[PDB]
Amino acid sequence: GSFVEMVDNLRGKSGQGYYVEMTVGSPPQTLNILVDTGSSNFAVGAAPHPFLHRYYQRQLSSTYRDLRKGVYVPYTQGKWEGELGTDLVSIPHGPNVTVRANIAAITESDKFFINGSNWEGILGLAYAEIARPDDSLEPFFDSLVKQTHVPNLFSLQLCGAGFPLNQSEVLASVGGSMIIGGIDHSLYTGSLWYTPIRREWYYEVIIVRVEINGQDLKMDCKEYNYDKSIVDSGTTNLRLPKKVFEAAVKSIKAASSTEKFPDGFWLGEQLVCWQAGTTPWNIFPVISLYLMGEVTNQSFRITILPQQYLRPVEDVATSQDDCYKFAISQSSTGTVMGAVIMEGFYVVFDRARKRIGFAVSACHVHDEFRTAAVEGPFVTLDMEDCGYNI
Numbered sequence: 001g002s003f004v005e006m007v008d009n010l011r012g013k014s015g016q017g018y019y020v021e022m023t024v025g026s027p028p029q030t031l032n033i034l035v036d037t038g039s040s041n042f043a044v045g046a047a048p049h050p051f052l053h054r055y056y057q058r059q060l061s062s063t064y065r066d067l068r069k070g071v072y073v074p075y076t077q078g079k080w081e082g083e084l085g086t087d088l089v090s091i092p093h094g095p096n097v098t099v100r101a102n103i104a105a106i107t108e109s110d111k112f113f114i115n116g117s118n119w120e121g122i123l124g125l126a127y128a129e130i131a132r133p134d135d136s137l138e139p140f141f142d143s144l145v146k147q148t149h150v151p152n153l154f155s156l157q158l159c160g161a162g163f164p165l166n167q168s169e170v171l172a173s174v175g176g177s178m179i180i181g182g183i184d185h186s187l188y189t190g191s192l193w194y195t196p197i198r199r200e201w202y203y204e205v206i207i208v209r210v211e212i213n214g215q216d217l218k219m220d221c222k223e224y225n226y227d228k229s230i231v232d233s234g235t236t237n238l239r240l241p242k243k244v245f246e247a248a249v250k251s252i253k254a255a256s257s258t259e260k261f262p263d264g265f266w267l268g269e270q271l272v273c274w275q276a277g278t279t280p281w282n283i284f285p286v287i288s289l290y291l292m293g294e295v296t297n298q299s300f301r302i303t304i305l306p307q308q309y310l311r312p313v314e315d316v317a318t319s320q321d322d323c324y325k326f327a328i329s330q331s332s333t334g335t336v337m338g339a340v341i342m343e344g345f346y347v348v349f350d351r352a353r354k355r356i357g358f359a360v361s362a363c364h365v366h367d368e369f370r371t372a373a374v375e376g377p378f379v380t381l382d383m384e385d386c387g388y389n390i
């Protein structure tokens, strides 16, 4: 561990997202910010809202600069509108630098802020191509790298607890680490394996094979990346393209057939509970995603356990039972490797070398019989054909 100042600087959980503390303005205004590798804007609440107990007050910052331009950001689950500007920004438990970055001051929103999440803004870590209004609005990390000597790379260790965390607990627990500008060896075990970043917009990758307990899903690999596959700290579930989801669920049901679960469970709608300590992890299969390697015709695989894809939730009666929701769901916008994948691994976003690294996380949840894994290499042909083209 060479970055002790940044280790354990995250808080939160997959259901509400993971956040890091940041400061904006002069004097510094502290805010908690959602870490999102699935978007590219730095936006913070800048007006009163029922679910916020603090927000960015531009009139109190001597270094605030108005860009005199609005920004509207509508998405599937919600939306927000803001006013663009720039200000000095820092990350207390991060690199010891202060940079002038773009900030979308959120003045109106719908279904964005969450009651009890404890975060007041979002940090989009993806590329400029997907920044709103357009790619001319420089993303925070781009500014950080351009204005300082911080290496163009960051790594994330998202730590799921393995059990439900109440309001007080989630506030006092360490949710993981975001190492800005480097890789901390204390956050993973084994080796790091890299997959190429296919294109720099979202953090796009290419999946070349999928197994459920060693059994090949056997679909045309293009299906696995239709219409794209991305790594997103801002998505709770492992989301799969409709046809892949259908085949995967069928296989997971078959592997766990000694126990029957209601359709609502598989739809991610209702929870399933077991007497305290008796969750039958062993009847559920491990899932392996093979990713294109850096060497020609070479791939590697990352394997997760049900301890990753069964999300712990508190029982409706807050009993002593151990309950979960199935965290794999369908998508009409490609594969999304969300917290379900990320909680099992230390993930290195090596922007400098256009690649993403994976290693078994020192904080992944497992049992005495199985562990998450990152293994390689495997001989794989025509992997370029697995990538989708409109």
Ligand SMILES: CN1C(=N)N[C@@]2(c3cc(-c4cccc(C#N)c4)cs3)CN(c3ncccc3C#N)C[C@H]2C1=O
Residues within 6 Å of the ligand: 014, 015, 016, 017, 018, 036, 037, 038, 039, 040, 041, 043, 073, 075, 076, 077, 112, 122, 124, 130, 132, 232, 233, 234, 235, 236, 338, 339
């Ligand atoms: C998938 N995904 C995502 N990666 N990021 C967004 C948000 C995620 C959460 C959220 C809430 C709770 C838990 C978790 C988790 N884990 C995440 C709140 S808002 C932001 N977004 C944008 N997209 C494009 C441009 C700008 C923006 C913004 N802002 C589309 C949203 C989305 O649907």
